[PDB]
Amino acid sequence: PKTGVATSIVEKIERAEFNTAGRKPTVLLRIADFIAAMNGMDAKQDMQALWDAEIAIMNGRAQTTIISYITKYRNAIREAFGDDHPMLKIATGDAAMADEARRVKMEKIANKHGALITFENYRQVLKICEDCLKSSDPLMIGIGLIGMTGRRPYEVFTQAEFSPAPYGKGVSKWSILFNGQAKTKQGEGTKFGITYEIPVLTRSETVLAAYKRLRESGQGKLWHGMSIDDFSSETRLLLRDTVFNLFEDVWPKEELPKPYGLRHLYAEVAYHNFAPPHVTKNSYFAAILGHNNNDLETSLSYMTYTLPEDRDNALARL
Amino acid sequence: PKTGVATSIVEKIERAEFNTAGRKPTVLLRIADFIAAMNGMDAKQDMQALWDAEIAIMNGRAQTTIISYITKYRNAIREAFGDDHPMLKIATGDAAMADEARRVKMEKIANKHGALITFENYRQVLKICEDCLKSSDPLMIGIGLIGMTGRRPYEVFTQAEFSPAPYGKGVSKWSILFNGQAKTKQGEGTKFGITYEIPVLTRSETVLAAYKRLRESGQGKLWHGMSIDDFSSETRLLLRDTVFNLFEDVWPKEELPKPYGLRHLYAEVAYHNFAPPHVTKNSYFAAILGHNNNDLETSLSYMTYTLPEDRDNALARL
DNA sequence: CAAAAACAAA
DNA sequence: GATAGAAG
DNA sequence: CAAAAACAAA
DNA sequence: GATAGAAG
């Protein structure tokens, strides 16, 4: 069509109107305005004018940033005007800048694989996680699960289901059943909707109980179901402060201690203790991380560290 | 321009005219004809007609095949009419079929990583290679180098340079300096033209001498410099028969023994004996195989087998 | 007199 | 086809 | 009476 | 941007 409103954005601008403090929502503003402007636009060249002006405002911002912004625009257009709107053929970044973006990523990752960080104090890190599994503070439990199960924060906190995994005619003690994969949309070969088994790094018993507590806390019951902008607003800076605090003294010198660090390490340790002999590391990761079928490319991003044992062994060839 | 001839094709058709035997060069024929037809064509829509007819002849052939054929066409056009000819915007496969081709590859490789083949008798395989390093028959030596150094056949046989590698203030005994990477064209981040160090699987001494012999044999001196269609014609079926013969009794049951098998295994063993602790397997491969800078995607294709030791270890976690 | 959305990076 | 860590 | 380019698959 | 294992 030629009309409709981006409800979600508007909502956010409206709340923003009466906050005790905070910087101005100028970008949600540009988007809202843009969407208004589009109403009763039939002509491509006009739509092009509107987009091109938007692009030009964004000059100065970082490439990675610009690209993210373009997504906010696109979801807004899609929300307001549906999927079929010709503005979605226009509102995109140019191809050259995408091409460079790719290059940049390849370079980064290629550099990590050539310079893995030795996770000297890793066992300490996992103990700490295990211990947080026993904390009264739901946040702490959460951190504990990210360390122990490898689920992303958003997963742990707002939407993960954890079943006990059947191990023959009993119960698996080194893995649980997980559901609520994020970053995934329905489709052949996709973990969306799918329950599946992932190794964990301490008694399935423990883990499962801890998730029960978290699920039942006040803050937990709040978290449960939150969209991502919600969850980020509620919890991101807190969780980042906590994790920084908590692991600061044991994290490899090379980098600062961040929540996703747990998922990276988790993959590494799980592989190291549990990987069967006939699958590759890339495969094992893409498996335990809930990656799409045949997606082996994404594993490459989690190859971050090396365990001091593995490092010691390489050196054992002198 | 609007004129020129594909010299190489013509040459091949001409030789073909008086062979004692062999099937008819009908495809080089279609290409030659096509190139003739293009002479004095200025109009896109005509060029489109010519291509579309070519495409339609190719129906029935396999996708992988068709795509290869399209390359022969394109190199022919490029040879005859240069790089700038608008027919190169037309002579290509459709995008849907490429997209599927990609899918197909991803699926294949994703399947190998989930079902690695245990190379039970691998040490036998490498011994055999070592022993061929001592054969009087240059072919045999060649096989020996593919097993021992990981260079592709075309590399070993026609254009590889092997220096001794400096190891501190002496000489490296577990690696040599290599040059003549094939499948590579000049460019930032490319091993073309580049000498570089690759591990080998037996005394650098041995290897280097053996390559000297091969280089100095009659057949060697012939091989040296051959284009790829030459080399294939001269040597491919022979080398495939030999390798089939030679390794038939020790190759994993799962697959037949083929020359590239050596390069796959080579990567695996080199990693297993020589990989430093701070680099990933993907990285190590892309390194020792002469892959482009930041190319980590191509390593994924060489992850084919698993060593019975590594397999035994995985199982050691019961 | 010193806490609570933009900008950016698998 | 481009998505989902500076206002008492 | 039985060896010497098409077709295809990193 | 698409390249490089059935004629004595």
Residue numbers in the entry:
A (entry chain A), B (entry chain A): 104 to 421
Q: What does the publication say?
A:
Hairpin telomeres of bacterial linear chromosomes are generated by a DNA cutting–rejoining enzyme protelomerase. Protelomerase resolves a concatenated dimer of chromosomes as the last step of chromosome replication, converting a palindromic DNA sequence at the junctions between chromosomes into covalently closed hairpins. The protelomerase enzymes function as a dimer, making staggered cleavages of both strands of DNA to form covalent 3′-phosphotyrosine linkages, then exchanging the released 5′-ends while holding onto the 3′-ends, and finally sealing the broken DNA strands to generate two hairpin ends. The TelA monomer consists of two structural domains, the catalytic domain and an α-helical bundle domain, that together clamp down the DNA substrate.
In this open conformation, the first base into the overhang region to be refolded (Ade6) completely swings out into an extrahelical position and stacks against the Tyr201 sidechain. The path of the DNA strand is set by the stacking interaction made by Tyr201 that orients the first base Ade6 and the capping interaction made by Arg205 that shapes the nascent hairpin loop structure. Point mutants TelA•Y201A and TelA•R205A are capable of cleaving DNA to form the phosphotyrosine complex, but they are completely inactive in producing hairpin products in vitro. This underscores the important roles of Tyr201 and Arg205 in refolding DNA into a hairpin telomere. Consistent with the critical role of Tyr201 in orienting the tri-nucleotide stretch Ade6, Gua5, and Thy4, a crystal structure of TelA•Y201A-DNA complex shows that Ade6 has swung out further toward the protein to partially occupy the space taken by Tyr201 in the wild-type enzyme, leaving other bases in the 5′-overhang flexible.
